[PDB]
Amino acid sequence: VQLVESGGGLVQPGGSRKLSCSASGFAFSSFGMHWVRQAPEKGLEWVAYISSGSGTIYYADTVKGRFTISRDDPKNTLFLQMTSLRSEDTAMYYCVRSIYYYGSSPFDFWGQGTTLTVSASADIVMTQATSSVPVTPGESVSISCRSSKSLLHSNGNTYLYWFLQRPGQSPQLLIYRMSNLASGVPDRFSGSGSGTAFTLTISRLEAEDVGVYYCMQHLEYPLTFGAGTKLEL
Amino acid sequence: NTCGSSDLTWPPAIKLGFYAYLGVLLVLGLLLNSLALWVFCCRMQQWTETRIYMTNLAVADLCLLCTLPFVLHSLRDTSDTPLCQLSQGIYLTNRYMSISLVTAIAVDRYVAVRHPLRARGLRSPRQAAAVCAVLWVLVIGSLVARWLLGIQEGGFCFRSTRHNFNSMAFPLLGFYLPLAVVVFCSLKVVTALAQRPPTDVGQAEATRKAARMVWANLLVFVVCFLPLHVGLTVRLAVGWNACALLETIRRALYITSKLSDANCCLDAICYYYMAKEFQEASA
Amino acid sequence: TLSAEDKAAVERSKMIDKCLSREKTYVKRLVKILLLGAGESGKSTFLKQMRIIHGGIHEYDFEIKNVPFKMVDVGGERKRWFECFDSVTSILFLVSSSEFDQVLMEDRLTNRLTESLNIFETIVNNRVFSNVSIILFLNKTDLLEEKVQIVSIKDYFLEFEGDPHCLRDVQKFLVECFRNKRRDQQQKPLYHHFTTAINTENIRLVFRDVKDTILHDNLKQLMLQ
Amino acid sequence: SELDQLRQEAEQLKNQIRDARKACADATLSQITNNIDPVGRIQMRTRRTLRGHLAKIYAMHWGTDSRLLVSASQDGKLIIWDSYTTNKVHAIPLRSSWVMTCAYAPSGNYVACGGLDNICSIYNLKTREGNVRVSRELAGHTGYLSCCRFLDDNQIVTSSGDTTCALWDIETGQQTTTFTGHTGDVMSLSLAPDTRLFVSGACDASAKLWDVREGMCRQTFTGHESDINAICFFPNGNAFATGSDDATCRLFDLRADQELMTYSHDNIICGITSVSFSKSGRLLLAGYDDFNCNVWDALKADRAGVLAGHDNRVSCLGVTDDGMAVATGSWDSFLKIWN
Amino acid sequence: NTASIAQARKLVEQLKMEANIDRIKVSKAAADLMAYCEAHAKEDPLLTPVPASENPFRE
Ligand SMILES: CC(C)CCC[C@@H](C)[C@H]1CC[C@H]2[C@@H]3CC=C4C[C@@H](O)CC[C@]4(C)[C@H]3CC[C@]12C
Ligand SMILES: CC(C)CCC[C@@H](C)[C@H]1CC[C@H]2[C@@H]3CC=C4C[C@@H](O)CC[C@]4(C)[C@H]3CC[C@]12C
Ligand SMILES: CC(C)CCC[C@@H](C)[C@H]1CC[C@H]2[C@@H]3CC=C4C[C@@H](O)CC[C@]4(C)[C@H]3CC[C@]12C
Ligand SMILES: N#Cc1cc(NC(=O)C(=O)O)c(Cl)c(NC(=O)C(=O)O)c1
Ligand SMILES: [Ca+2]
Q1: Which ligand 3 atom sits closest to the C-alpha of B230?
Q2: What does residue B46 show for φ and ψ, rounded to 5 degrees?
Q3: Which of A118, A150, A175 is where one domain is finished?
Q4: Do the bridges between strand A197-203 and strand A140-147 make them parallel or antiparallel, or are there none, so unpaired?
Q5: What crossing angle do the helices spanning C43-54 and C202-221 adopt, rounded to 10°?
Q6: CATH number for the domain running over C32-221
Q7: Shortest CA distance to A83 belongs to which of A68, A72, A95, A93?
Q8: Which residues of D fall within a CB distance of 8 Å from C6?
Q9: Class of the domain covering E5-57
Q10: Which keywords appear in this protein's UniProt record, sorted alphabetically (chain D)?
Q11: Which of A93, B107, C191, D308 is the least buried, fewest Cβ under 10 Å from its Cβ?
Q12: Atom 13 (ligand 2): residue with closest C-alpha?
């Protein structure tokens, strides 16, 4: 399981580029892919999504039609062709794998991503309670989040993803669907919520638990992240 | 211009003979096709390709036998009767659909006998339904084209003039190619049922019965649909500038019409009743 | 109303269904041949001769005339749970033709030919094998020809009314015995072939018999017999 | 010492066991359950029609979540699909296309399959690579595999063509425990709820209860007339039903060590391929060789319901742990759900 | 286990092990089965059908 992203550099505004992500250690043809962005002064933002069979391809409203995404399964590669870049595209792009079935863990592995700099609504809004809360090792921290609409669906299971991004590292799946813990995470993390207000409880904090915590919904194709709560030592 | 659109007078003996022929036909074939549709829709199970083909053939035969009295009644109009137009249109539709269906059955037998291994991925009930549907569509389109080409120059009913070299093109091209295809399929089936490996006398009797049935179907098709299209072919030899032989050709075609309509009866006693599955299902 | 994860799961299920439908063509075009022996009937030699064309359950999958053949060998039908071969196209039955004077290795006063006929009878009488065809391969034809001249088969079998010390008569007698021991002689044809491990055209006979079986069942599906 | 003396001692012990069972049989299950009100005619409709298999379905098993269902097909495919939306979660091909049994782990992380090949293949559904790989190919049997059941994520019980049963572990990967008490071809296995006992039927009329920890057959039941093909433990854990090649399905009790009732009817003459109990244990579902399945009253011994939705021979039958639905798979490549 | 008698001595010992087990009356076992079937008679869609709203398959 490894994702290597390349194709980043200084690009003049109005130009074009092609980000390439190489996948290894897993079946690339069986995983849907998501290109997301993170600004140096802002949080995570979803850009594009392609299905495992290249059947369902969607983009964000800010990059709808401007960008395009394709994948080569015999080569295990993901291409993101961007054109007419502006100042809003100067960010670090991450490639995320996600397989969708009952009990699956979408957005499990996040690639290292690549930086891109330029010289130059009917969507769910996720609101964090506090941008940064001081924490101490061995304590308990409860990160609160609010959604524009209830994330509960008629199927019976909520769609809420809490992710952790350590300073200088790629994000990692912490909790998916508000109840199930990801693969390879400590049992100290817990998630709860009634549909609108969500809470992430962390007990017995450690050195690696610090960083920015993000919240994401998965009800509609225009996925939106949150502001992110900064837990510092 | 010698019109020749005169009624065909028949002696009382020949008229009573034709009446008895049409009665025996419209009774026997009607009952046979009704029982065939009754057993091939609710009695039998496991819908297969040949079952769909036989169901469509029985439907076409019943439609032809039900529309034949209307054609016989409205035959004596000779100019523009819409009733005659509709009756003869449905009649020709049913007849050429029966021909096409016999051709599709011959093609299916060729695929299932000449190439048994290469038939496991080219034969399916959905394929049979698609073939029946496309044949229905093609026959209906050919009849609509004949109606369109006849209503502009002449007519469509049997007593029209100027049966053009384009109006009577569908008849001479909607049987000759199907006849050649049926002959080819029957020959390949009877030559594939003869080179089978030697086995017990049971399989030999079975393949001999199958060859006899295929030959009987071919002979019935030829004797019922070829004599009509021999007259239809020689009729285009003399068109506008015809002569007194036009009445003889018309009488010959009227006689062969009964032989062509007897196909709906001769196919029930050669496709349905001679088959063992139909007998096992009905009894 | 299907959510994003629901629609993605439906799309994944549709891709799985598409792959399964793609393999369904190969499954339908597949011709299954269950290979069975009778003890010292040249099984290893036959498998070695067949591996040339190919190149406890052993599967040999190959393609001939653009159609796939899969031969399944049990490796050496008395459990009543082997109905898994109810959909196979044919069953090959290998019998050694030199079992007239070749007493069973157990030496319990019984010829190997009698045991082979008994196994064949117990196999053909199975209800799941009523829809499958049988191809009988009588191996050791050269050994049979060389042995029938030395020892006559009338001494060990008091039902051979033909002329002993011959070859075609003994083959006809064996075929007649194998055919009469079977009790349907109709539902599916029986095919007999005499060959050794020398010639390599043994697969052509199997292909011809499979084609004849498929023709025989297409005749039933076509209401021609 | 002497073979005749040993045979005489065995006959004497058999007669002693028979006399003890007759003495302990002061009444019958029907005589006691006659006062119980009947269940009545039940109506189970095909809520879900799970299709996609390329060949006949041979086995099935339900998980603890009572939502994912695993099914094995003769085309060498294990399909694990969701029951609520009929979506195929996984479809794994098999090395050996001849599969006869499949088992779903209680934790949902592993699956097991076996059949004519003597290799029991265990796959891991939860993997980082995403594709369900072959975790283990454990094979130490001398006959074709017939049934598989998961005790936990490590212990797994299997039965083969020979008269032996094997308890394997995943850590070591070898046959930890061996049971060699049967005489015929073992067919089906059913684990008790406490995960300490399991009854197994063979080609003979003997169904034997085996302990996981001890390793010896505590009890045996010889009351059928043909080969037992199906098995199912009672929800409580002290009873089990056995179906054979005849229409008789006999219920035995572990505590009483004797048969209780024999669900059978003169109209039914085919065999039994799958037997499953409800969560309450009142309704006993049994798949027959005919083109339908039956549901009898486990207490009053009466045919409560008939499910004639399958066109071919019903092969596998399972009941969810919560008892919400009942899955039925026949040889027509169609899996159906009944509520 | 002499003169190839282990094939029957083991079976005799196994039958001896089975003949010494404690057996209860069939009446008490039937009563226990009835009590278990009556105690868990509820929350079972097979014995008592559940409404379409509570059934995940129906709704
Ligand atoms: C291989 C499968 C698809 C069967 C193919 C059968 C084809 C080759 C045969 C079967 C029936 C035949 C048709 C029978 C009669 C008609 C109607 C006629 O007015 C035009 C020609 C036409 C349309 C024939 C064309 C050839 C034909 C379509
Ligand atoms: C003018 C045309 C298009 C309409 C009439 C075509 C009719 C007669 C033909 C064409 C398609 C055929 C049907 C298509 C679907 C099936 C599938 C099979 O499992 C049962 C037979 C059945 C129901 C066929 C019966 C005959 C059928 C209805
Ligand atoms: C068994 C097959 C060959 C029967 C073929 C029937 C055809 C060839 C026969 C049957 C009826 C016959 C016609 C009967 C009517 C007439 C009018 C008469 O004044 C001259 C003969 C003539 C013109 C015949 C021509 C040939 C004819 C059409
Ligand atoms: N029924 C009938 C029928 C059909 C036909 N068939 C045709 O006319 C034809 O093949 O076009 C015919 Cl020529 C006749 N006799 C006629 O005089 C006539 O109406 O043309 C009767
Ligand atoms: Ca005229």
Answers
A1: 8
A2: 55, 70
A3: A118
A4: antiparallel
A5: 80
A6: 3.40.50.300
A7: A68
A8: 85
A9: few secondary structures
A10: Acetylation, Disease variant, Host-virus interaction, Intellectual disability, Phosphoprotein, Repeat, Transducer, WD repeat
A11: D308
A12: B129
CA angle, residues A167, A173, A174, in degrees to nearest 5 = 90
Q: Nearest by CB to A55, which of C6, C9, C11? A: C11
Residue with tokens 């899969």: C70
CB contact at 8 A, A167 and A176: no
- What CATH number was assigned to the domain covering residues B12-282? 1.20.1070.10
Distance, in Å, from the CA atom of B201 to the CA atom of C186, rounded to the nearest integer, reads 10
Domain count, chain A: 2
Which of D240, D209, D241, D204 has its CA nearest to residue D224? D204
Return the residue in C3, C7, C13, C15 with the most chain A beta carbons within 10 A, the one to mutate for interface testing.
C3
The SS3 assignment for C9 reads: helix
| A226 Ramachandran zone, left/alpha/beta (phi>0; psi -120 to 50) | beta
Ligand 1 pocket, residue B138 CB under 6 Å? yes
Nearest C-alpha of chain D: how many angstroms from C122?
18
Mutate to test the pocket of ligand 1, among B107, B168, B179 (most ligand atoms within 8 A of CB): B107
- Binding site, residues of C? 40-45, 139-142, 197
Question: Which residues of C sit in the known binding site for Mg(2+)?
Answer: 44
Cβ separation B117–C221 shorter than 8 A: no
Chain C: nearest CA to D87, how far in angstroms?
A: 5
Resolution in A: 3.2
Instruction: State which approach was used to obtain the coordinates.
Output: cryo-EM
- CA C34 – CA C56 distance, rounded (Å): 13
Of C71, C156, B44, nearest to C63 by C-alpha is C71
Residues A39 and A76 in one domain: yes
Is D91's CB within 8 Å of C87's CB? Answer: no
d(CA A90, CA B256): 86
